[PDB]
Design a protein around this ligand. Sequence first.
Ligand SMILES: [Cu+]
Ligand SMILES: [Cu+]
Ligand SMILES: [Cu+]
Ligand SMILES: [Cu+]
Lengths: 105, 103, 107, 103
Amino acid sequence: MATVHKVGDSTGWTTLVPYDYAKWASSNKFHVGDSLLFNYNNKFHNVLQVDQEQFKSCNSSSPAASYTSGADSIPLKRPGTFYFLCGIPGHCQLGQKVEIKVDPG
Amino acid sequence: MATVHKVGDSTGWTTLVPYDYAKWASSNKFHVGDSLLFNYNNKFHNVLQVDQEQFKSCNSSSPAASYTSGADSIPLKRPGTFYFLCGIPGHCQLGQKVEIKVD
Amino acid sequence: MATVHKVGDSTGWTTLVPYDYAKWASSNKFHVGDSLLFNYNNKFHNVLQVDQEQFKSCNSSSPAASYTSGADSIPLKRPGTFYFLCGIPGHCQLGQKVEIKVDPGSS
Amino acid sequence: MATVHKVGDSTGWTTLVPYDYAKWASSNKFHVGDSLLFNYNNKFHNVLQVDQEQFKSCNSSSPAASYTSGADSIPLKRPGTFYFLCGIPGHCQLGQKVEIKVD
Ligand SMILES: [Cu+]
Ligand SMILES: [Cu+]
Ligand SMILES: [Cu+]
Ligand SMILES: [Cu+]
């Protein structure tokens, strides 16, 4: 049985207050088959999949994938590092971004 | 021996033709541990889990979960009745919705 | 052989003047594997795939598929009748809609 | 006499990882009568045929043709050099473009 990981737990995907999404990620163990659930007010944020370089620079100008439901379920079908961030101007820079490590050795 | 239930069989999840999803669900036996597989053109459809009220009114404004892979594998780990519909404008009203009773 | 059918030929997809897209379709023979090419100014029109009911009523509120490139290539992979129309308010009603018959049994 | 060239092989048409499409094209021999197959998640990418100038500048403003099926089968019926790129903002600049020399 796979696992659905709620990003930020009860806090969800937000910029309201500082939230260490890196620590949230490290408190979780991601396996192939699992999924991510991003809960947020879709009138304020979105979820964009980017690469390492874009993630580090909070570059949201050319995302690989985009989600805007406010309750996005995202599949983790292959091992590796995935990166997600909110593309609204200034949000990623305030910490709204998360690195997901799926089945590392 | 879990079972994967392919929603709409080969027809999949669409509005191209009328398709009786209720009848499809009835031709299936859902048990805890099983899963649902929604195959569709993800550029034009989506899969949203909603509550009974939203399902009836075809309300896709506050989904419990939104799937957009085009090949969504959704687990059935709890007994009860669950509802899914496509949130694309008017699709649910065209019949793209399905009630799933587990156990 | 797979053929790309240019909707409206040199006239393209437009509402500028009346254009009988039904006669354009009739002048063509659609076979599985073929495709349609819709040429238009994407700042003015779009291409929406709908069902028979919507086609007849020019209802563009719930299309099955949508295209907005101005040079849309659309695949015809299975036999049957497909319907397309421009969803911009009033355009379909002025004639911007086309019925595509793919590999029908009879003429 | 007739070959289907799967763009990017199993990797397909994407920006998820750097992928050398130029090298892929070079590992292939295109002859009139062949075809190109672009496999991708059609919710996030597209395939546009453009001219040399637009290809170089990654200009997707006026494509000769736009494919969005996620499994586009594009015929190569004429010898010469043709250009394709994904028009999604910034994808072409990330390397999602391919030059095809036929015959
Ligand atoms: Cu945000
Ligand atoms: Cu839909
Ligand atoms: Cu129009
Ligand atoms: Cu792309």
